[PDB]
Structure formats: structure tokens, C-alpha cells
Amino acid sequence: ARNIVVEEIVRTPVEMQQVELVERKGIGHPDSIADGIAEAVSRALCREYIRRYGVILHHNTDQVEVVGGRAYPRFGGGEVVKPIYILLSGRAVELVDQELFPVHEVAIKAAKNYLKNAIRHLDVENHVIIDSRIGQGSVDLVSVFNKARENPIPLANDTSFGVGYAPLSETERLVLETEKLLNSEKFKKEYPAVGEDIKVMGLRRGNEIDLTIAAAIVDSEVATPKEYLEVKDKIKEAVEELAKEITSRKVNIYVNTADDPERGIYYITVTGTSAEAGDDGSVGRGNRVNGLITPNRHMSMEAAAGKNPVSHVGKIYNILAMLIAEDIAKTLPVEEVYVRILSQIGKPIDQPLVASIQVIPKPGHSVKEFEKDAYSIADEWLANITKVQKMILEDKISVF
Amino acid sequence: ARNIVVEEIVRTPVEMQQVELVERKGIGHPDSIADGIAEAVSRALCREYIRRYGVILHHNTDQVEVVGGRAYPRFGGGEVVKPIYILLSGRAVELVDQELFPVHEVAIKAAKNYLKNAIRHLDVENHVIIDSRIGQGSVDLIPLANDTSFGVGYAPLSETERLVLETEKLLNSEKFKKEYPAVGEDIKVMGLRRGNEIDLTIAAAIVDSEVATPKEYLEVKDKIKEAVEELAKEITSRKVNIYVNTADDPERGIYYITVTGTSAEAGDDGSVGRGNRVNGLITPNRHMSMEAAAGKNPVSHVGKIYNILAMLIAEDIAKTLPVEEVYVRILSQIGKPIDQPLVASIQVIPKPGHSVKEFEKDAYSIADEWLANITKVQKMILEDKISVF
Numbered sequence: 001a002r003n004i005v006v007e008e009i010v011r012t013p014v015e016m017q018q019v020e021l022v023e024r025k026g027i028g029h030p031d032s033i034a035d036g037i038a039e040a041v042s043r044a045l046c047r048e049y050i051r052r053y054g055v056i057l058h059h060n061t062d063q064v065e066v067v068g069g070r071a072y073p074r075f076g077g078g079e080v081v082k083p084i085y086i087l088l089s090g091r092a093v094e095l096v097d098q099e100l101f102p103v104h105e106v107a108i109k110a111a112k113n114y115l116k117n118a119i120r121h122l123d124v125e126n127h128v129i130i131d132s133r134i135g136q137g138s139v140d141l142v143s144v145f146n147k148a149r150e151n152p153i154p155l156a157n158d159t160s161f162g163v164g165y166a167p168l169s170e171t172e173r174l175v176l177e178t179e180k181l182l183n184s185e186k187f188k189k190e191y192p193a194v195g196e197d198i199k200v201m202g203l204r205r206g207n208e209i210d211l212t213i214a215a216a217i218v219d220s221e222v223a224t225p226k227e228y229l230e231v232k233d234k235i236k237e238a239v240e241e242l243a244k245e246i247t248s249r250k251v252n253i254y255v256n257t258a259d260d261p262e263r264g265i266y267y268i269t270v271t272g273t274s275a276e277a278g279d280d281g282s283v284g285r286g287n288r289v290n291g292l293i294t295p296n297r298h299m300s301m302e303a304a305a306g307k308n309p310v311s312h313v314g315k316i317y318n319i320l321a322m323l324i325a326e327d328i329a330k331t332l333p334v335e336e337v338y339v340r341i342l343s344q345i346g347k348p349i350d351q352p353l354v355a356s357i358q359v360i361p362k363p364g365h366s367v368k369e370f371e372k373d374a375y376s377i378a379d380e381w382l383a384n385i386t387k388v389q390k391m392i393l394e395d396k397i398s399v400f
Numbered sequence: 401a402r403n404i405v406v407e408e409i410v411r412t413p414v415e416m417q418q419v420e421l422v423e424r425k426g427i428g429h430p431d432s433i434a435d436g437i438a439e440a441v442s443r444a445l446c447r448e449y450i451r452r453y454g455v456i457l458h459h460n461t462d463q464v465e466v467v468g469g470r471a472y473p474r475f476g477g478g479e480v481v482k483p484i485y486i487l488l489s490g491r492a493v494e495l496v497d498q499e500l501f502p503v504h505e506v507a508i509k510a511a512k513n514y515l516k517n518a519i520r521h522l523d524v525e526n527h528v529i530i531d532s533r534i535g536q537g538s539v540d541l542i543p544l545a546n547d548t549s550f551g552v553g554y555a556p557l558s559e560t561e562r563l564v565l566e567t568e569k570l571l572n573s574e575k576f577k578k579e580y581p582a583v584g585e586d587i588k589v590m591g592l593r594r595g596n597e598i599d600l601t602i603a604a605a606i607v608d609s610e611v612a613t614p615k616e617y618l619e620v621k622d623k624i625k626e627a628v629e630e631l632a633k634e635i636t637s638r639k640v641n642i643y644v645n646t647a648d649d650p651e652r653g654i655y656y657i658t659v660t661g662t663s664a665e666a667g668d669d670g671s672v673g674r675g676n677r678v679n680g681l682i683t684p685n686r687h688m689s690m691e692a693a694a695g696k697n698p699v700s701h702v703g704k705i706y707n708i709l710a711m712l713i714a715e716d717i718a719k720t721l722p723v724e725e726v727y728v729r730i731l732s733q734i735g736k737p738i739d740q741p742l743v744a745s746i747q748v749i750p751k752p753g754h755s756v757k758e759f760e761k762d763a764y765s766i767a768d769e770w771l772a773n774i775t776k777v778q779k780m781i782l783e784d785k786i787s788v789f
């Protein structure tokens with residue numbers, strides 16, 4: 001019934017390709033800040049719609065602009081001189097049966113709460129201005145409930161595709177886990193000088209990987225250039241240990257490569273994010289839903305962060321494509337699998353115009369031998385598509 | 401000696417894959433409006449820096465937020481009820497040796513001029529609010545790489561890529577607009593190929609002042625369909641199915657009519673880097689860069705230059721040599737001039753019956769000459785001769 005297509009492709013697996021480039025924008029990167037606020041706003045709206053009406057009402061808050069401020073970092077502690085300005089945009093239902101729903105209150109509080117929990121040394125009350133221009137919508141709940149009855153699985157409202165793949169390469173895992181380690185609670189507690197604005201790039205040529213880390217250091221935690229350099233060495237040491245667990249390839253680690261001590265240049269910040277110094281961010285400019293930027297792979301340009309987890313395929317299909325890919329890679333004799341899913345307007349989101357599965361089989365196997373099981377994995381996930389709504393709101397799946 | 405590497409790759413060509421997906425967001429789509437404004441602002445800043453100082457000063461205007469308005473379309477002509485709001489962001493040099501450069505004036509003027517020329521039925525003075533929060537820079541009056549920057553491009557386009565690209569270009573061309581003024585600029589095209597059959601879905605905003613009745617609206621949709629059917633026959637002999645404004649439901653009174661020709665009027669939002677790559681397409685069957693070219697300084701941003709150069713190198717190779725596919729990737733080497741990349745990888749599938757040895761030397765030479773003329777590409781960008789979305 002469902003438009004699922006399984007095909008074999010021939011390609012050099014990424015692990016065997018000569019040049020592989022992978023990047024991850026960490027939590028404090030301005031683009032990832034935009035994504036994180038967008039998603040925090042969406043989840044807060046979902047939960048408050050549920051609390052008041054028992055159902056999620058339509059909204060999309062996948063539009064956030066982070067306008068950088070100005071700052072004077074100094075060893076021992078600088079100051080922010082001009083605040084970061086953040087504009088929340090999108091659309092949400094505001095009039096519910098002639099009654100007013102507190103869209104802007106929920107959104108601004110969610111954005112502020114996200115920043116406080118994400119960027120430890122950022123003074124949100126004084127370093128940030130948050131304004132909201134979220135568009136106004138209206139609905140009658142009887143209609144909402146009737147729409148839910150007519151179509152238990154929501155209808156697609158856009159023509160969009162999501163893209164995912166599996167399994168991850170060593171270089172992909174290295175980049176992902178380097179950022180996760182350095183922004184982990186345990187590491188932050190041990191090394192409070194390491195801010196959250198961390199960008200990780202892995203470039204593999206053959207069996208040698210250059211792993212470059214741009215990590216904003218918090219100037220209130222380093223009194224001297226010497227203490228700053230000791231922090232960079234502690235970053236390098238921790239990532240060296242991590243790399244030995246992920247790959248037996250040679251890994252060269254570089255931290256804050258624009259540093260130039262003789263010219264007095266160090267990557268120190270007041271708050272731990274370069275957004276303080278004038279760098280800007282917006283939604284969908286960084287990691288895909290698997291958490292990575294991967295030009296050796298395939299992606300959708302849809303920004304998952306902030307999109308309605310109930311009906312917007314731009315989020316749902318990018319998550320589902322990754323989950324189907326991971327399932328196939330985990331259970332079948334596959335070297336690589338790429339999943340692309342395209343919505344059809346007016347049809348339920350479990351009836352995509354196509355769900356395309358492209359597989360490189362392991363040597364000694366053919367896709368024909370397992371094509372029906374691959375179909376079945378995609379079919380069961382599409383038939384259970386609404387559970388993605390549940391995993392988002394239970395904070396079980398990240399979208400950047 | 402530039403580190404250019406030409407190698408053969410063995411992989412299923414896109415045209416032989418069973419399923420291919422291609423999308424293009426047309427000029428009036430909110431995301432493409434953001435991209436277009438971003439690039440229009442950058443080029444206006446470049447020209448005015450040159451006019452005043454003889455050099456381009458540092459800037460990045462790759463941050464634009466299009467916040468949709470409200471509108472009540474009506475057959476015969478509706479009205480915009482709440483204006484579109486556009487925030488310009490990024491950074492530009494504003495203090496030039498203690499004197500003030502009119503960043504915000506240049507930027508707002510450039511944004512308004514772009515909209516005026518791009519969206520025919522948009523009343524910019526009354527339908528749009530443009531504000532600027534571009535960050536303030538300062539300065540006192542072949543570049544080296546400061547980072548590892550990346551560009552990726554490919555050629556030639558597949559039949560489905562060509563159909564999607566040329567469908568939007570046709571419907572938003574002046575010649576077509578003159579004959580069918582009811583067709584707005586907010587056109588989104590999705591192409592799905594399965595085997596030798598292509599499904600083409602077109603969402604095209606129709607201008608409500610140009611259609612007096614539902615009957616005229618349906619006639620306009622049929623003229624879109626007929627025109628694209630003709631175009632498809634020029635590109636492919638695969639079966640092509642064309643669908644226009646598929647969410648329409650006449651019995652329930654739903655038609656894709658707009659006052660201005662862009663869904664930004666009705667509350668849809670856009671921002672930079674959410675849509676087309678520099679070749680004009682969104683192509684999940686290919687390899688794409690995540691960087692937003694629009695608004696980036698074309699003189700100093702290596703990622704923008706390399707993504708354009710990679711496309712130009714690929715297109716040249718595909719046009720002149722016996723290649724079925726070519727993928728071009730360029731990586732800068734930190735601390736070296738940008739015309740001396742860390743690697744320029746040229747990956748080719750030869751046409752059947754051919755081997756790369758026949759033409760590997762010519763492919764190297766094509767890549768070499770483009771890298772040697774990186775300054776020529778920068779000029780082409782400012783002369784509006786190369787599109788970036």
C-alpha cells in the first residue's frame with residue numbers, strides 16, 4: 001500500500017573514500033543556539049497546549065534570529081558591552097475559541113530557560129534581549145477535535161522530504177562525540193573554563209584524521225595566557241583518549257588554531273559563546289538531525305528545529321528517515337543505507353509519495369536477498385509515525 | 401603546482417538510480433526572498449565601499465528574517481492587512497577612519513530595490529517594513545586561508561534536475577510573465593523520478609487582481625500545466641506528470657490566490673540558507689554544502705568562492721570532456737593563498753566506453769585555470785553574472 005522503494009546502489013563506502021569531511025556546530029554556536037531556542041519554544045508550546053486543551057494546536061517556530069552583541073574579553077574577566085538580540089518568529093495559535101493563548105509569554109520564557117541551561121556563564125537577564133514576533137493564529141477546538149477524528153494520522157500540509165542514513169563512520173562518530181564530551185556536564189564541571197561554543201571539524205585523508213576544535217574559553221576562569229594554554233592542553237588530552245576508543249587511525253588534534261600569543265590573540269570570551277562578539281545565528285544553518293554536517297553523505301535542507309512534531313514532515317521525515325536507516329543498518333547485511341521520504345499534500349503523513357531506500361550491501365550479499373525485510377522496517381516505522389510525536393515531547397530525540 | 405587530483409570513481413550514476421528527488425524554491429518563495437535580499441545587500445555594500453574608498457570593506461549580510469504578514473485575497477483583487485516585516489542582520493564596517501559609512505541606508509535601499517524588481521505585484525512602501533540591525537564594524541584604511549574552507553559542485557544536471565530548474569525559470573521569466581501576469585513569483589517545484597516516470601508538483605501563487613473568477617484561475621493553472629508539458633518534451637522522453645496547486649479544493653472554496661504573488665503576505669516565513677544551493681537546486685541525491693552563499697563577501701569568504709568555483713569547474717569539465725558525472729571539491733590550506741588549495745579533488749565517471757586517462761590532463765588544466773582566475777570569478781559575482789541560489 002505504501003510507496004516504499006528498495007534499490008541497490010554501487011558506491012565506494014565512505015570509510016573507504018580518500019577524503020572525508022565532517023563538522024559539528026556545538027551547543028553554544030550561534031546557529032545551534034538559534035536551533036535550540038526554536039526547538040525549546042516549540043516543545044514548550046506543545047506542552048502548554050496539551051495542559052490547557054488536551055491537544056497540540058498548530059504552530060511552527062523554526063524561525064529564530066540571533067543578532068550578536070559586543071564584548072571586551074579580558075584575562076581574569078571581561079564584560080559584555082552590548083547585549084545579544086534574539087528575535088523569535090514563526091506562527092502559533094493564539095486565539096482559541098475567542099480566548100487568548102499566551103504564545104509570546106510561553107515562547108520568551110522557553111527561550112530564556114533554554115539559554116540559562118545551555119550557556120552557563122551567560123547572564124540572560126542583562127546580556128540578552130528577546131523579542132517575539134510570532135504570527136497569530138486562531139482556531140475553534142470543536143474543529144480541531146473533528147480534524148483529529150477524521151484523520152487519526154495527520155495530513156501533510158507541505159511538499160517536503162527528509163533524508164537520513166546509517167551507519168556512522170569513524171570520523172563522523174569522532175566529531176560527534178568530541179563535541180558531546182566537551183559540552184558534557186561531567187567535563188564542564190571538571191573544566192569550567194571551556195565554554196559551550198565549540199565547533200569540531202574532522203578531515204580524514206586516507207587513514208589520517210585532522211581534528212580541529214574551535215572552543216570558546218571563558219575569560220573569568222583563566223587569569224593568564226599560561227592558564228589558557230593549560231586549558232587547551234586539557235582539551236587535547238581528553239580528546240586524545242576519546243579518539244583511541246573510536247578509531248585506530250592516526251588523529252592529529254588542534255585547538256583554537258587562530259590563536260597567536262606573540263600578537264596577543266586568544267579565543268577568550270566573557271560568556272562562552274561568540275554570539276557575544278557580533279556573530280549571528282539563524283535556524284537550519286548547522287547540524288542535521290543526526291547532529292552532523294556531512295558533505296560525503298546526503299541531506300535535506302528542511303530545518304527540523306522548531307517545526308510542529310505532529311504534522312510538519314520537515315521534522316518528522318528527517319527523524320523517521322534516520323531511524324529507518326539505523327534499523328536497517330543494525331539488522332540487515334548492509335554496508336550503508338540512505339533513506340529519502342517525500343510527502344504528498346492532503347494525504348496522511350504515513351502515506352508519503354515515496355519512501356526511497358538505497359542500500360550498499362555487504363560483500364557476499366545482494367539487496368534482493370533482504371529487500372522485503374528492508375521494506376518491512378520502513379513500513380512499520382511509517383505505520384507508527386505518530387510515536388515520533390511522543391519521543392520529541394519526552395525529550396528522547398535531538399533534532400540538531 | 402596546484403594540488404589538483406583527478407581520479408575515476410565507480411558508482412551508480414544518478415540517472416540510473418531508481419528514485420531521484422529534486423526541489424527548487426522560486427524567486428518569490430520566502431526563503432529565496434531572504435537569500436536574494438542578503439545577496440542584494442552585500443553587492444550594494446561592495447559597490448558603495450568601492451565608490452567611496454576604492455576597496456571592498458569587510459561585511460557579511462547572510463542573515464535575513466522574513467516575517468510574514470496577513471492578507472485577505474479576493475478574486476478581482478484583495479488587500480494586504482498587515483505588512484511583511486524584514487530584519488536585516490549580519491555585520492559591516494560602519495566606522496572608516498572615525499567617519500561614518502551609511503551601512504543601514506545602503507542595506508535598506510538595496511533590500512527595497514531587490515523586492516521591487518523581483519515581486520511585480522508587491523507594494524514595497526506599504527506592504528513591507530524593513531529594519532536593520534547589521535552589526536557595527538570599524539577599520540583604518542591573493543588572500544591567505546585562515547581556516548579550512550570547503551566547496552563542492554557537480555555536473556551535468558540530470559533530466560529531473562533540469563526539469564525542476566527550468567520549470568521555475570520559465571514560469572518566472574519576463575516573457576512568460578508578460579503573457580500570463582496572473583502567475584506570481586512564489587513558485588515551489590518538486591520533482592520525483594521513479595524509473596522512467598517523473599512526477600512534477602508546482603505550487604504557484606496566483607495574483608488575485610489578475611483573475612476575476614475561479615474560472616479564470618483554473619484557466620491560468622491549465623496554461624501553467626500546458627507550458628510545462630511543452631518544456632518537459634524538450635528535456636526528456638520519460639513520462640512526465642505535472643500537477644499544479646494540488647492543495648486546491650474548489651468545492652470548499654480553497655484556491656492558491658494571493659494579493660502580491662508571494663506567500664510571505666499570508667504569514668509564511670523565510671530566512672537565509674534554507675533553500676537552493678548555488679546551482680539553484682536542492683538535491684538530496686547529490687552532495688551539498690551546508691554553507692549559505694547568499695550575503696557572504698565574494699572577495700574574502702573562501703567558502704562562497706570555492707562553492708561557486710567548484711560548480712564552474714564541474715560545468716566546464718562536463719561540457720568539454722567525455723564525462724557522465726563529475727564531482728569537484730576544494731579544500732583550503734590554512735595559511736596558504738586561496739588559489740593554492742590543500743586539495744582540489746576532481747572525481748569523474750567517464751562516459752561508457754571511455755577512461756579517465758584519455759582526458760585526465762585536460763580536466764586538471766580546466767581546474768587549474770579556474771583556480772588561477774579566482775579574481776575573475778569574484779568580478780563575475782559582483783556583475784550579477786553568477787547566481788548564488
Ligand SMILES: [Cl-]
Pocket residue numbers: 011012409410411
Ligand atoms: Cl564512489
Ligand SMILES: [Cl-]
Pocket residue numbers: 005418594595
Ligand atoms: Cl519505482
Ligand SMILES: [Cl-]
Pocket residue numbers: 293294295550688689690691
Ligand atoms: Cl558543508
Ligand SMILES: [Mn+2]
Pocket residue numbers: 031280281285
Ligand atoms: Mn552561520
Ligand SMILES: [Mn+2]
Pocket residue numbers: 431669670674
Ligand atoms: Mn522554509
